[PDB]
Short mmCIF file of C-alpha atoms in Angstrom, two decimals:
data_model
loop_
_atom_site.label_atom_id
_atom_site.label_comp_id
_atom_site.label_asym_id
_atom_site.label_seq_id
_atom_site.Cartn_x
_atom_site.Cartn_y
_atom_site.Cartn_z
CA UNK T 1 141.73 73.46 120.71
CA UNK T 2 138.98 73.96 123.08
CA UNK T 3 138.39 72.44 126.42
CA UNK T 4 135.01 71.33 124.72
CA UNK T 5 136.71 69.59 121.43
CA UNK T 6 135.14 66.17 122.19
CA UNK T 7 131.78 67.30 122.54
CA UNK T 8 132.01 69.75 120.02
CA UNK T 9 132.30 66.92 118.13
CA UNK T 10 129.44 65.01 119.37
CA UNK T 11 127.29 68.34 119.05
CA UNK T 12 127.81 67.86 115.27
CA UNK T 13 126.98 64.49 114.82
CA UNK T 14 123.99 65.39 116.43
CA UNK T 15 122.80 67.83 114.12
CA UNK T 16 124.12 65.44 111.46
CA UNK T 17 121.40 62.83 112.59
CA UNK T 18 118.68 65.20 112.79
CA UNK T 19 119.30 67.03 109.31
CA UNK T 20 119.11 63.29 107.72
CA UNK T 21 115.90 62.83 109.47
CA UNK T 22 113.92 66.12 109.35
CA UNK T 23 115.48 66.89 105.51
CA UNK T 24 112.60 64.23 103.74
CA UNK T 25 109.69 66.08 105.49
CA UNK T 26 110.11 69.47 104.35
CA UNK T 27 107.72 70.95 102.13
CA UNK T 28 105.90 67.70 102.65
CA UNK T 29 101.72 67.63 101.60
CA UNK T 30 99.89 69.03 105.14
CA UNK T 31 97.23 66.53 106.58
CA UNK T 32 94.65 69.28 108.52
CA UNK T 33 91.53 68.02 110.43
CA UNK T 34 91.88 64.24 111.55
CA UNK T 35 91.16 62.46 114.80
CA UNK T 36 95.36 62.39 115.42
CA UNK T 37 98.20 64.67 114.22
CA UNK T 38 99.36 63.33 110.93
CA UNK T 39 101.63 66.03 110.81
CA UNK T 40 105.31 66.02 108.68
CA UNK T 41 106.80 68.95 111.46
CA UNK T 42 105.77 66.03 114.17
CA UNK T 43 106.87 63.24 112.83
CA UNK T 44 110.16 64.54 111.80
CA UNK T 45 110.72 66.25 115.28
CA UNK T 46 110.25 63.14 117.01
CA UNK T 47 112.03 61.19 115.22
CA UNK T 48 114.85 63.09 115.30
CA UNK T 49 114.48 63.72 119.11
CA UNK T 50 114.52 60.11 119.15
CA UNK T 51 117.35 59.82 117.67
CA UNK T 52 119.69 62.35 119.56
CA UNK T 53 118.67 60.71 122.65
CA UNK T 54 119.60 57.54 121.98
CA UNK T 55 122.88 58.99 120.79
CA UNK T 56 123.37 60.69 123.91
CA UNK T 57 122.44 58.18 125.96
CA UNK T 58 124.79 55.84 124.62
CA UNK T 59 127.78 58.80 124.53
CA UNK T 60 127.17 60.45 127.98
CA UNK T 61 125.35 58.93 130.24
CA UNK T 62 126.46 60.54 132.88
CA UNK T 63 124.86 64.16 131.17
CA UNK T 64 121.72 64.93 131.55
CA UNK T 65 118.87 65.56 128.73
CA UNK T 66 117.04 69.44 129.61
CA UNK T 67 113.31 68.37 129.32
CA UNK T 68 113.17 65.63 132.30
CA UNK T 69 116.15 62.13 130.12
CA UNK T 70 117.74 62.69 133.37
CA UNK T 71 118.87 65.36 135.53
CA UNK T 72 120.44 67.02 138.62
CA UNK T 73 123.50 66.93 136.94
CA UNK T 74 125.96 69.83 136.50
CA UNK T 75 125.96 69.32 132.31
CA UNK T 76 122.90 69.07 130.67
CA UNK T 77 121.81 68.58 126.57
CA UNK T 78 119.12 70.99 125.30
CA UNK T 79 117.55 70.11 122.33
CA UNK T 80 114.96 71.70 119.30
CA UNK T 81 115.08 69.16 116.59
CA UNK T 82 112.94 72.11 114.52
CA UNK T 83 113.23 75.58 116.16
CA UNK T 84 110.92 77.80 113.99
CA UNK T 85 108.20 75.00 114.09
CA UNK T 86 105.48 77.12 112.45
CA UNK T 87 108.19 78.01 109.70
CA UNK T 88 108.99 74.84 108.65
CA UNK T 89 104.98 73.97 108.41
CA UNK T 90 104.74 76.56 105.88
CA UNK T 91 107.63 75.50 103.92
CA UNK T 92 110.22 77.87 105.23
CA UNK T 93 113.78 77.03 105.12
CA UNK T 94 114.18 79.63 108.57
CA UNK T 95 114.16 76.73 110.65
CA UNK T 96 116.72 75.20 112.80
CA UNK T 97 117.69 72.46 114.73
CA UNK T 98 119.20 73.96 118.06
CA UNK T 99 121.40 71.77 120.20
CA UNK T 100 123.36 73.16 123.32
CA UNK T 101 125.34 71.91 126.24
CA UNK T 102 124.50 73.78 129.77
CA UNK T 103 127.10 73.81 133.00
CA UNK T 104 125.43 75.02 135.99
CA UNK T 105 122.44 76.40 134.16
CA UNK T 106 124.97 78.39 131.70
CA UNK T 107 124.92 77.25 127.66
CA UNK T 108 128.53 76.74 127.03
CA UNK T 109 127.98 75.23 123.32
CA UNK T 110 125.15 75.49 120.80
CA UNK T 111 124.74 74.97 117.50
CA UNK T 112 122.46 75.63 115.04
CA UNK T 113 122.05 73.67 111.60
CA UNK T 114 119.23 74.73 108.86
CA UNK T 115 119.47 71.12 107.53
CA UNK T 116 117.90 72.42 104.06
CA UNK T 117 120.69 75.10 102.97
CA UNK T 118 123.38 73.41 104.61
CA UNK T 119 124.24 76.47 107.31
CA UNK T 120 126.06 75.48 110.67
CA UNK T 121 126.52 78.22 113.18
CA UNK T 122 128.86 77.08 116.36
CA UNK T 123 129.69 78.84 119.51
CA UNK T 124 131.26 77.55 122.63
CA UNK T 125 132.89 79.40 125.87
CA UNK T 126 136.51 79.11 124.63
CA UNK T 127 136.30 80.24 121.21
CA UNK T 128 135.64 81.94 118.11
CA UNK T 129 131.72 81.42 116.68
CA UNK T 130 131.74 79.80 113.05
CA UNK T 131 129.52 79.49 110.45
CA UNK T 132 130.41 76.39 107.76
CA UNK T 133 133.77 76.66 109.76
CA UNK T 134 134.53 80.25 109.30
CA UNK T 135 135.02 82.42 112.06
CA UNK T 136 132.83 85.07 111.81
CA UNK T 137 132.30 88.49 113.62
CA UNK T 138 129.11 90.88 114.41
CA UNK T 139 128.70 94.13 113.28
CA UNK T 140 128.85 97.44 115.24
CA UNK T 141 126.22 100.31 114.98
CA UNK T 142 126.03 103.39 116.16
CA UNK T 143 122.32 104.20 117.27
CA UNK T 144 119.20 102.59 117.19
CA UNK T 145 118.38 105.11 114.09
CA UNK T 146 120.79 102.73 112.24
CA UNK T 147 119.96 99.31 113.03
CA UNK T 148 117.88 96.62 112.27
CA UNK T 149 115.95 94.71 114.48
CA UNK T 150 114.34 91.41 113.76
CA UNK T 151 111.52 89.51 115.92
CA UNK T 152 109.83 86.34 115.37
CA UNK T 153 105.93 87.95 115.49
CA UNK T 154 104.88 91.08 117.36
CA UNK T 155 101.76 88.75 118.10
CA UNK T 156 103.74 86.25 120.01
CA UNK T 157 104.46 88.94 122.53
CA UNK T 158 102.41 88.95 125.71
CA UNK T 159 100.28 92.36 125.75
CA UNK T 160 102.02 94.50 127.79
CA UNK T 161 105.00 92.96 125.79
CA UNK T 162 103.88 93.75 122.01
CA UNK T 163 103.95 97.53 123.71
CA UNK T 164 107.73 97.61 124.71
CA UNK T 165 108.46 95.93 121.00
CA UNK T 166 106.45 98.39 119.58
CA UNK T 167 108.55 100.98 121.19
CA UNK T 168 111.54 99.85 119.99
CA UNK T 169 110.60 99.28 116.78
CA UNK T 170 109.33 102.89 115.94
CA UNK T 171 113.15 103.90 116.75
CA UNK T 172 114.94 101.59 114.61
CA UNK T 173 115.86 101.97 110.97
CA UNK T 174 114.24 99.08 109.50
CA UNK T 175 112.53 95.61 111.66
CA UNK T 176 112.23 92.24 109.59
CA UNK T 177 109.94 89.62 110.77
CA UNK T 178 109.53 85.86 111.13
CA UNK T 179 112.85 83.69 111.46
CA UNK T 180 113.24 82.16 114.85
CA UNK T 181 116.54 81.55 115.77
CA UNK T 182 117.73 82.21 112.13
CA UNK T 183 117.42 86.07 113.12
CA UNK T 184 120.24 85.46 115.59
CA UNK T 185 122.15 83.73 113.14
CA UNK T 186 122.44 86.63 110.68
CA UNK T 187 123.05 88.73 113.99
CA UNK T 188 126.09 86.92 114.64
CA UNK T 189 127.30 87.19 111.14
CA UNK T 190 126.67 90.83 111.09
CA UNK T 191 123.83 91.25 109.03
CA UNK T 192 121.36 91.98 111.87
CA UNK T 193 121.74 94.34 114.96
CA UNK T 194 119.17 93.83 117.32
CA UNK T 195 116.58 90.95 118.18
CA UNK T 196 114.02 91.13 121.04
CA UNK T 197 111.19 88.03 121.56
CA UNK T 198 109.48 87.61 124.70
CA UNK T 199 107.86 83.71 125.58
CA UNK T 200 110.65 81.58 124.53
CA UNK T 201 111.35 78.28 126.26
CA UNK T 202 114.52 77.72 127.29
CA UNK T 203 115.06 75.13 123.96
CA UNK T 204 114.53 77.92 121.97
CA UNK T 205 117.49 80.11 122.98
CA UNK T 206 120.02 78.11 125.36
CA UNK T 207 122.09 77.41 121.58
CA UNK T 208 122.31 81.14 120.46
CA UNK T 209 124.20 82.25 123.93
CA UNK T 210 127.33 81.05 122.83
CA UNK T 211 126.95 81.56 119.26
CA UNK T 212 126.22 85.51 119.49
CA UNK T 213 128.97 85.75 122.46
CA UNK T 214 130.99 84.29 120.51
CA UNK T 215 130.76 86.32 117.46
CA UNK T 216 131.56 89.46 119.48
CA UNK T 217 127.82 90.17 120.29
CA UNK T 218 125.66 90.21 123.96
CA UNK T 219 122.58 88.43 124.72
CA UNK T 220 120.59 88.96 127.87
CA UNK T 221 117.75 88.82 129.42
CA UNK T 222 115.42 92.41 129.07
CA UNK T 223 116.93 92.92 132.98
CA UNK T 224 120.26 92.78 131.34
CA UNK T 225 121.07 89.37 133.47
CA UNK T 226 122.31 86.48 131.55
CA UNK T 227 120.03 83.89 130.11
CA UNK T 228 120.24 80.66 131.99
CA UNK T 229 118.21 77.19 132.36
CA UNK T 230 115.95 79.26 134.25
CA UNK T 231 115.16 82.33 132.38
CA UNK T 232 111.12 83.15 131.51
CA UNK T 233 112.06 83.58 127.53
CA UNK T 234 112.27 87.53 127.09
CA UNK T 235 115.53 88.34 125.44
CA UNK T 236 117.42 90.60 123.74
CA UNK T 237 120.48 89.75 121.56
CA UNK T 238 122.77 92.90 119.75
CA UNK T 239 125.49 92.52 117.63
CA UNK T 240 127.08 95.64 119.36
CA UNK T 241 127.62 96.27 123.61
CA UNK T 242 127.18 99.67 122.72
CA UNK T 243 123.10 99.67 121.76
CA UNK T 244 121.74 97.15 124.68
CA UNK T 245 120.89 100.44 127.34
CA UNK T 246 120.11 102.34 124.41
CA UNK T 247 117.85 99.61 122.98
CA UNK T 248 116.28 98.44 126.51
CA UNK T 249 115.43 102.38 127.43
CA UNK T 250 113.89 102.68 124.05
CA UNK T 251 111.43 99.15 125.35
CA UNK T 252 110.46 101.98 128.41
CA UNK T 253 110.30 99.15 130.44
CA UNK R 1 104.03 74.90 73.55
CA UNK R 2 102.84 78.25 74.62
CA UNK R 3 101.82 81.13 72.60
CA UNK R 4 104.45 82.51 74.61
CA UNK R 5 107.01 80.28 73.92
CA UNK R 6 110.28 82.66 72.53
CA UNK R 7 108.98 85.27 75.41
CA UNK R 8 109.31 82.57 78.25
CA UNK R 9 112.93 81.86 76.52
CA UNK R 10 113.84 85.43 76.84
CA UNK R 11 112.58 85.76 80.20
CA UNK R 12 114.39 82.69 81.83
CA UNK R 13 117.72 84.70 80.11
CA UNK R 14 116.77 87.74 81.81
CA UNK R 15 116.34 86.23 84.96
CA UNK R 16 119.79 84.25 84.38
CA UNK R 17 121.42 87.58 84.09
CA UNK R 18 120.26 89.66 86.44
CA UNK R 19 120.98 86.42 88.80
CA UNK R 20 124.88 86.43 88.22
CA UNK R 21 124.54 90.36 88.75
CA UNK R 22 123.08 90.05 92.22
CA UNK R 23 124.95 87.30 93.76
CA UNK R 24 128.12 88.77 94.19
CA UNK R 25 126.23 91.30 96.25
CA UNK R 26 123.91 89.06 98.87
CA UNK R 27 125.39 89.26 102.37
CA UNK R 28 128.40 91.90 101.39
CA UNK R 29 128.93 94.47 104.15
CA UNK R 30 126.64 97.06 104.44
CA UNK R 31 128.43 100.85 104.43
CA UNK R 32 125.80 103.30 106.01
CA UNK R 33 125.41 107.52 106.91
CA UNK R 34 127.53 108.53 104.05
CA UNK R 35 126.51 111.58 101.97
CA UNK R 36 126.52 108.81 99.35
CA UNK R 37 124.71 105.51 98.84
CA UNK R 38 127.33 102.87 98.55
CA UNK R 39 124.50 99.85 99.55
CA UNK R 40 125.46 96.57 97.68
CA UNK R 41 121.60 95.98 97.19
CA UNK R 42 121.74 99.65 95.41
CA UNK R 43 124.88 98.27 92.90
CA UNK R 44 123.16 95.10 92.61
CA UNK R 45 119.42 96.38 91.72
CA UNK R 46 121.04 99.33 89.31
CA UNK R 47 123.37 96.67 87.53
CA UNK R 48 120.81 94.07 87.01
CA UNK R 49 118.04 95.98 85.54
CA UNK R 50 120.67 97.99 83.37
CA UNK R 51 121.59 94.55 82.18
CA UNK R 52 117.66 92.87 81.50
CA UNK R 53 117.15 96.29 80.04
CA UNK R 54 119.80 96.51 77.42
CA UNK R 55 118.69 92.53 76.20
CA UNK R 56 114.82 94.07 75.86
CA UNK R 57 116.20 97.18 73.87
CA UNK R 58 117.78 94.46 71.45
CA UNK R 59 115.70 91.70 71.43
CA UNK R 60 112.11 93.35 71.93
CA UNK R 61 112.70 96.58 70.34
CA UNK R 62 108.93 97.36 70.02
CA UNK R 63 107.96 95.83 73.42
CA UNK R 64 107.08 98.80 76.42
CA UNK R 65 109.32 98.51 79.92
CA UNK R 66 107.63 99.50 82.85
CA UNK R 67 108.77 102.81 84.40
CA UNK R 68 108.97 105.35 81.69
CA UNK R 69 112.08 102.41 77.75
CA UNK R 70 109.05 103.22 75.52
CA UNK R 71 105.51 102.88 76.21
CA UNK R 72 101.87 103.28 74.95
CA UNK R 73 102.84 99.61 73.49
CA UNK R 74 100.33 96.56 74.06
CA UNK R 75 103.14 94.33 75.54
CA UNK R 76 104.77 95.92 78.27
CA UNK R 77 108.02 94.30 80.57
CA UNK R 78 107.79 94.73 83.78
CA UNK R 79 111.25 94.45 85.93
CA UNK R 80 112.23 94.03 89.81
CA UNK R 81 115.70 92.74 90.22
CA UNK R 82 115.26 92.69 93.97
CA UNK R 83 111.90 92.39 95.46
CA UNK R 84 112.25 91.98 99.18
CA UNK R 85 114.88 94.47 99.09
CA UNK R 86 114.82 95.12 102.91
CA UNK R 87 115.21 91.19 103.41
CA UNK R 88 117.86 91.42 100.81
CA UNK R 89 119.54 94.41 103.10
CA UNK R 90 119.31 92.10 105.68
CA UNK R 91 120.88 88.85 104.49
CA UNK R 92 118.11 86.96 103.97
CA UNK R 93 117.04 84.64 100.43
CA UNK R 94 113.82 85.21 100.32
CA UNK R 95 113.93 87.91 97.76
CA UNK R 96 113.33 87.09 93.95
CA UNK R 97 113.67 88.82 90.82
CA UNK R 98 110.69 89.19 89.07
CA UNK R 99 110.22 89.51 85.59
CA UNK R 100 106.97 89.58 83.89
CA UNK R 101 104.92 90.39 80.10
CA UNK R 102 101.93 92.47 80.56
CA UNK R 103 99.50 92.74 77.21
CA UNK R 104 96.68 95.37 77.48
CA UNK R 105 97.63 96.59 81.29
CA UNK R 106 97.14 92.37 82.06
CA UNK R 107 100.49 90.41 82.98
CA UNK R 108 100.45 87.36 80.62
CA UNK R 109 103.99 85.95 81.75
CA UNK R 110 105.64 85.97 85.17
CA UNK R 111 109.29 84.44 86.88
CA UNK R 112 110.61 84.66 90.22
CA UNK R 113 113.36 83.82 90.87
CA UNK R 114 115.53 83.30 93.81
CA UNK R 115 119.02 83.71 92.77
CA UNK R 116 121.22 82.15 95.70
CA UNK R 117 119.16 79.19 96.31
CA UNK R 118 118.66 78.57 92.88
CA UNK R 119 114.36 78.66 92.85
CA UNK R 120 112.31 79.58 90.04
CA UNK R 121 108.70 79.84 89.89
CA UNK R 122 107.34 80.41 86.22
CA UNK R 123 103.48 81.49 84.50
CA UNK R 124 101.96 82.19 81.79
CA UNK R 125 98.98 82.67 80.85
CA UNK R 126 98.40 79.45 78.39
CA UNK R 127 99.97 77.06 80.72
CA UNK R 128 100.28 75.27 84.05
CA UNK R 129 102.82 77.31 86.78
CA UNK R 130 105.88 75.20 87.25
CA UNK R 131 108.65 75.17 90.25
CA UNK R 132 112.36 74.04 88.92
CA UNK R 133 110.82 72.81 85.86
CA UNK R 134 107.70 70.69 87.12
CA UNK R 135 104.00 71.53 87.41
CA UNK R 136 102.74 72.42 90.93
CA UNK R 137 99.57 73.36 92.60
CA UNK R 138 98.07 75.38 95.27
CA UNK R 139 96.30 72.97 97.98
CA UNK R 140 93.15 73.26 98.86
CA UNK R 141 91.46 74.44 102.23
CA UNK R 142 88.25 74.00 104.27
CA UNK R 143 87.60 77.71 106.15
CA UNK R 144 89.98 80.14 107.76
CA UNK R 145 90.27 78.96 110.70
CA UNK R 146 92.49 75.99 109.10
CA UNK R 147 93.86 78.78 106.83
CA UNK R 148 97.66 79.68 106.83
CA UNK R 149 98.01 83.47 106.34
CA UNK R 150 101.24 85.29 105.34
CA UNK R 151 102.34 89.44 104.94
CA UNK R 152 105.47 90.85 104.89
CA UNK R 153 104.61 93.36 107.77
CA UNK R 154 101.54 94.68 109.41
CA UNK R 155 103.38 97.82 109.32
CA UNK R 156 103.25 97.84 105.35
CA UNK R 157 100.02 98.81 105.35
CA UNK R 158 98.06 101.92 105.72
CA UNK R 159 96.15 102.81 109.06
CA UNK R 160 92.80 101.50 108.02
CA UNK R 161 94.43 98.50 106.42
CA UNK R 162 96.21 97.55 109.81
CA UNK R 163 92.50 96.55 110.90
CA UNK R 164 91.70 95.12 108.10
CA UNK R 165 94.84 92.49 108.30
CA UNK R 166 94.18 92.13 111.72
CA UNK R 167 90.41 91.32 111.54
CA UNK R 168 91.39 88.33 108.63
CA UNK R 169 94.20 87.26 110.92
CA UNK R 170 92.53 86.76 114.12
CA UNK R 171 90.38 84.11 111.98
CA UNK R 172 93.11 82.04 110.36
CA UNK R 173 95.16 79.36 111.81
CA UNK R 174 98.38 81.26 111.75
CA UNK R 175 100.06 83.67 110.32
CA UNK R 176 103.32 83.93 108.51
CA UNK R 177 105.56 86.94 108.57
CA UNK R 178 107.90 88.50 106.06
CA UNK R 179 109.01 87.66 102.52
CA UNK R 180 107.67 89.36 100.13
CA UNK R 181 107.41 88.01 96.65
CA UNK R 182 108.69 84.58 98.10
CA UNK R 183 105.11 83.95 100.11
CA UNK R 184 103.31 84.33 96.94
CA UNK R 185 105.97 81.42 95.25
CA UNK R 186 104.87 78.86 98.57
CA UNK R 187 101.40 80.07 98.19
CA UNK R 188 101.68 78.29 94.35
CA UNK R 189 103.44 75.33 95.68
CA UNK R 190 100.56 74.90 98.01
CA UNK R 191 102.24 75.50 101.31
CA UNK R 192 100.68 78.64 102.02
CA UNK R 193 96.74 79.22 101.73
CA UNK R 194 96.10 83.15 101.80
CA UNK R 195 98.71 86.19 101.11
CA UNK R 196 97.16 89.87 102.07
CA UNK R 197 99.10 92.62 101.14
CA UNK R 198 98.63 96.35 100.40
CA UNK R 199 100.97 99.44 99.10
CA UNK R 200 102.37 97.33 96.40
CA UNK R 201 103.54 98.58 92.64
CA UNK R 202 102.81 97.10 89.82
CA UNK R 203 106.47 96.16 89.75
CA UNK R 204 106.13 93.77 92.69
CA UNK R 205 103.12 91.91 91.64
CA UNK R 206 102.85 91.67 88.05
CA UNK R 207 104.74 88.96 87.77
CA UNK R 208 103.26 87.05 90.81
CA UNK R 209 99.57 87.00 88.88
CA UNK R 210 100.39 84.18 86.22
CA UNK R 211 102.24 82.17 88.94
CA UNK R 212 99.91 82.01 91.14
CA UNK R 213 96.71 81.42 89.13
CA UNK R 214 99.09 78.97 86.90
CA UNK R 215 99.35 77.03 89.81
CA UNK R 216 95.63 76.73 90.29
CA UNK R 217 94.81 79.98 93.19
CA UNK R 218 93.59 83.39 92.88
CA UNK R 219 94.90 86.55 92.82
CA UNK R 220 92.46 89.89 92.78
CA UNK R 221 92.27 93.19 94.60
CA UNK R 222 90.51 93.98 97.90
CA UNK R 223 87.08 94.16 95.93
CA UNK R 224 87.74 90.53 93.72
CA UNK R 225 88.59 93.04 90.61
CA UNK R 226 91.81 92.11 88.08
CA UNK R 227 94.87 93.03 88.74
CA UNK R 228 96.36 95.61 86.19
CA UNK R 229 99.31 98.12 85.41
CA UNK R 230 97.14 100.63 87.47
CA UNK R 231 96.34 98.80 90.12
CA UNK R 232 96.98 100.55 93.56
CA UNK R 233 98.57 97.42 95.20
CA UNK R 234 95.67 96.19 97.64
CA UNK R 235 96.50 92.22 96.79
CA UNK R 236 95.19 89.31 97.86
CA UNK R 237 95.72 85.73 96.75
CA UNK R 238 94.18 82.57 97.64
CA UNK R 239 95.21 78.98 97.16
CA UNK R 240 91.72 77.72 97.45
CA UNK R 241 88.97 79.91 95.13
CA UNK R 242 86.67 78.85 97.88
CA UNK R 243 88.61 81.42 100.29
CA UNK R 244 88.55 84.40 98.86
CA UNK R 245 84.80 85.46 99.73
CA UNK R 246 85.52 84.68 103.24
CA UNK R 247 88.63 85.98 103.46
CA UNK R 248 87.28 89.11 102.13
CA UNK R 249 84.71 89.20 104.57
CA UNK R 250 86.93 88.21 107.46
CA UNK R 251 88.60 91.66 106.95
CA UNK R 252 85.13 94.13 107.28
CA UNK R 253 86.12 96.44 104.49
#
């Protein structure tokens, strides 16, 4: 059992909550155009904020809630009710709910629930990752010839940035695109060998650190430091040790 | 009832079969730099279409398939048990099969179908596109700049036509990325508005043409021409008729 067991527990009711909320917006008719955002993605992303933080605050109130709510605090909750936001808007069952506990700035739990398909990825510090409650393992690769990489958008890179993906990219064997955290998902179950996004927030990726670790793979910032509360959002997850230098010279950073 | 009744039977069969072919294979480990290919998405694609296949040489014995099998015939099949086959390599379910009926070089008949999530789109020519069994429709949409855009890579397309994607997508409202035949399936359920796309065969959009228009949009070349057996796989498709001169435009060809 891990040192975490109670609020591994909590983590999943959490993502319970929000599933049941965001699930009856999906592929909802999109209001464009009005005075105020009449939006499905917003209404289901607030209320399922909403409804987390209530949870929390009611479960651990001595944590604190990454966004402003309170903080100072050694352990903090950091959550994405719908990570892959412009996904879901298009109908895209890529999206994910992301929630994570952080200990001095470090994720040391994260999960991530696609509420549609019913797909649970969990990592923490102590353990095996799962997915549906399976332990499951990332794959190894030999070269960058090999793999495949995955990014969000090459257009959500700054401009200097869409240059290093583009280097990369041109020495891979195949890139996919679109997918948010989902790409990190299928990294951590081995179908995926390298992701690289620059401009995430630190909602966006403080669930995956524990998830990849924990399925045998590395994730790091493009310095090769680790990702903490602090981090500016470039980051580079591989399902093998062996192809981060590899992968970061290719970037010619 | 459609003209095409007994040929929409057949075709929901085909895409049954080739659906219990493939699933075994989705997410499998992936061998790689062998002198052989031992890719589960090669065993999957080979079995399925040997499968559809044998059911046309019985059942249609004086229908064409696609690819070499008879031809010179009016009615034609045209099979792709995997398109998206690089988002298939990669563990991902948004490929579909697609299986369409082409009559004088026009397809007349389309399914996709996403085998692991259990989605089917299906056309024809004498009736309204249905989703699952219902009737669905594209939305509607003002101008570009409200319009959602999708492609399954920039890097799909020829040098020239990476400026022309680039010019339409700097004036929509976003862009989607990856997919394949699946974009085309959200574009009919009206959560996607344009779909540009070049390099296809006829094998990956035949089917998509009934679907699409079925569900109310529009699906042409790059100069608003028909799409046909000999097309050279400049696509684009529009949920909103309204779009497609601007859209055209947009892209300075």
């Amino acid at each position: 059992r891990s040192a975490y067991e109670d609020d591994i527990r909590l983590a999943h009711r959490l993502a319970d909550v929000a599933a049941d909320i965001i699930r009856p917006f999906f592929r909802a008719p999109l209001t464009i155009d009005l005075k105020a955002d009449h939006s499905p993605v917003t209404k289901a992303d607030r209320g399922a904020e909403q409804a987390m933080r209530a949870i929390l605050e009611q479960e651990r109130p001595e944590d604190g809630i990454f966004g402003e709510s309170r903080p100072d605090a050694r352990r903090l909750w950091v959550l994405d009710p719908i990570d892959g936001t412009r996904a879901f808007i298009g109908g895209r069952a890529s999206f994910g709910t992301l929630i994570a506990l952080v200990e001095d700035g470090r994720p040391v739990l994260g999960i991530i629930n696609q509420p549609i398909h019913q797909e649970r990825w969990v990592g923490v510090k102590d353990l095996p990752t799962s997915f549906n409650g399976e332990v499951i393992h990332t794959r190894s690769c030999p070269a960058l010839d090999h793999a495949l990489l995955a990014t969000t958008s090459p257009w959500l890179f700054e401009k200097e940035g869409e240059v290093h993906f583009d280097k990369i990219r041109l020495k891979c064997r195949d890139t996919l695109l679109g997918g948010d955290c989902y790409n990190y998902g299928l990294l951590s179950l081995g179908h995926c060998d390298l992701v690289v996004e620059q401009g995430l927030k630190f909602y966006d990726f403080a669930a995956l650190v524990p998830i990849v670790e924990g399925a045998g793979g590395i994730m790091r910032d493009w310095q090769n430091r680790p990702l903490n509360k602090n981090s500016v959002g470039e980051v580079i997850a591989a399902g093998d040790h062996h192809l981060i230098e590899p992968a970061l010279s290719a970037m010619e950073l």
